Assembly symmetry: C2
Homo-oligomer: 135 residues x 2
């Protein structure tokens, strides 16, 4: 059950790393606005965790839309939808640091740094979930 969930989390981690790499090379000015407006809303709502969830979804969705691959986006959306349904319940600040490193790498046009920023965000998040469920 935690390992049925963990199996989806592993697959999402691989795909999200790839999405950031494609987004690093194919991002539009339109793609940059959606990631930036989601990031600014995420920065505004640091003291309201419940409002921030919509923005984190919007930020990852903007990276997925920046791939310009419909098949890739549909699979990422389906895995993301499955994970939200399965896990129904400095956190504001450390997650913003991880969220910002992906955005800078994508802004730079650097695919390798983007993949590692996106991968590190998923790994640190996974470590936070494992430990929360134990206590």
């Amino acid at each position: 059950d935690r390992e049925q969930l963990a199996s989806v989390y592993e697959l999402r981690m691989e795909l999200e790393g790839g999405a950031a790499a494609l987004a690093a090379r194919r991002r539009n000015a339109t793609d940059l606005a959606a990631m930036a407006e989601a990031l600014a809303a995420l920065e505004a709502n640091l003291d309201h965790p419940e409002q921030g969830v919509e923005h984190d979804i919007a930020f990852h969705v903007a990276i997925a839309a920046a791939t310009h691959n419909r098949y890739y986006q549909d699979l990422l959306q389906y895995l993301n939808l499955q994970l939200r349904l399965a896990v129904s319940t400095g956190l504001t600040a450390v997650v913003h640091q991880e969220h910002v490193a992906v955005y800078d790498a994508i802004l730079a046009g650097d695919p390798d740094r983007a993949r590692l920023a996106a991968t590190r965000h998923l790994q640190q998040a996974a470590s936070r979930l494992r430990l929360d469920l134990l206590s």
Copy 2:
């Protein structure tokens, strides 16, 4: 052309997603492969090796090799998505294409790519396995584009 630009763009997108999934599967397989996984990859590879002059018989073996790697991830979700994606239909057989591919020696080039993934997975080396699996998918998409532009 056998396929027009929008069919070529959709196909390249499908290979692009397949490329990323194969790279993740090779890395997972490199770390977690057990004695039963090594036997299944070796057996499919031996069969592909034995059928270099018969491209027709090869398809079944190619699916078995990619499927054994997906099993070696030991992630049921990844394995099942890959089993489904590797049943994908391939480009139609043509007398002209079959004659040019033999002169090509396409099967030997492809065997070296299938072989580079097995060697990396056998060596318990994840970055090497991911690099070989991604290269296999990139070359296949590139070969497929040239075939769609040439009939």
